[PDB]
């Protein structure tokens, strides 16, 4: 919907937002998994 515009990856990481990208086979893919945790104490990841 918004061509010729690119997001800021670092701003999204600081704001704890998960973005999307284009995969190898031309399929849109979720390239990160983060949670709504302000600190970086191993809790922003969803795995733990």
């Amino acid at each position: 919907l918004y061509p010729e515009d690119t997001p800021d990856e670092e701003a999204m990481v600081k704001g704890r937002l998960n973005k999307v990208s284009v995969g190898t086979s031309g399929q849109m893919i979720i390239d990160d998994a983060l949670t709504c945790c302000t600190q970086d104490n191993y809790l922003h990841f969803q795995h733990v």
């Binding site: 990856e9 670092e10 990481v13 973005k19 990208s21 390239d31 990160d32």
Partner: protein, 47 residues
Amino acid sequence: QYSIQQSLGNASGVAVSPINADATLSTGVALNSSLWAGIGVFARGKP
């Protein structure tokens, strides 16, 4: 394909650093070529 970035940031994409080589450095000097230089008076030449 797509561009390969260098010195990746804080998340997501992967990167490859530029090729680093320093032990392979060497200096190329002939050290055997001999040439002579001089001045003189000649019939034809650019002064």
